Amino acid sequence: ALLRILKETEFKKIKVLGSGAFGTVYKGLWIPEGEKVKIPVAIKELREATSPKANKEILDEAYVMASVDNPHVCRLLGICLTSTVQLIMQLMPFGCLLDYVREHKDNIGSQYLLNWCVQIAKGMNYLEDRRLVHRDLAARNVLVKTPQHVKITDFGRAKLLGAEEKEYHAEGGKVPIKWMALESILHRIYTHQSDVWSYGVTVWELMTFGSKPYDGIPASEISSILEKGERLPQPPICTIDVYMIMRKCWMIDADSRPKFRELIIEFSKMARDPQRYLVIQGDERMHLP
């Protein structure tokens, strides 16, 4: 019902935006048959797998994906199954949040930063409610609909847990070490609470205006430094209150980390009085479109 099935006659890939492990993302146009509307979209065309899923398997997954409906998660709008699988998704015109904060850092104030933290927490809480573990939360995977509104995107790593499953046990390959919880690095275990760890790193990326975490430190050494108790440093604009939330996200004991529902509450409080919680030079003079 929520998932639209498209024919190749109903959309066009216009411009390549990027490529990754699972396929290629395009800017495109969706012109639904008979509807007399033209809708800007993102299209991801998936690479051919060694063992392609049957169409029935693909549609079953797509119907679940299409049902993920939250203001802060990028939604699958439709799918086309031909020689390739093409996913038609909401278009976030401003690109990823990491590049955005690097490009516009001189004009980003406390209100925007804290609002973004709230929105990301709300999106993640919704995913948790849907039993989805994202597994790749990072500023590069948060997309910008408008400067005032961001959406988390799943590029293919998200996993649905069974009603009685509390963990996803991964099967190896390339992983974003510097965003991962220790239990994920050491044991390939992923949970909603390991997503919370990654949320903390994502917030750190934002508060440093797009700094690279553990810059210059080899990925192979990360688990070692985490075990010693080392963590990402307090961003200069962060009050102790904000940094202490981030540090709680990186507790070794996963159940000692905040829940996303708690993060929504705490950052919502702070977003109501942003200059109390982040100290940015010239904050009251900045402006975004």
Give descriptors for this structure.
Kinase Covalent probe Covalent inhibitor Complex; transferase/transferase inhibitor; 289 residues; 9 helices; six-stranded mixed β-sheet; Phosphorylase Kinase, domain 1; 2 domains; Transferase(Phosphotransferase), domain 1; monomeric; Epidermal growth factor receptor; Transferase-Transferase Inhibitor complex
What can you tell me about this protein's structure?
The chain has 2 domains: 1-91, Phosphorylase Kinase, domain 1 (2-Layer Sandwich); 92-289, Transferase(Phosphotransferase), domain 1. Helices cover 32% and strands 19% of the residues. The protein has 9 helices and 12 strands. It has a 6-stranded mixed beta sheet with strand order 1-5-6-4-3-2, covered by helices on one side. A two-stranded antiparallel sheet has the order 7-10. A hairpin with a 3-residue loop joins β2 (11-19) and β3. It is found in: Cell membrane; Endoplasmic reticulum membrane; Golgi apparatus membrane; Nucleus membrane. The active site is at residue 136.
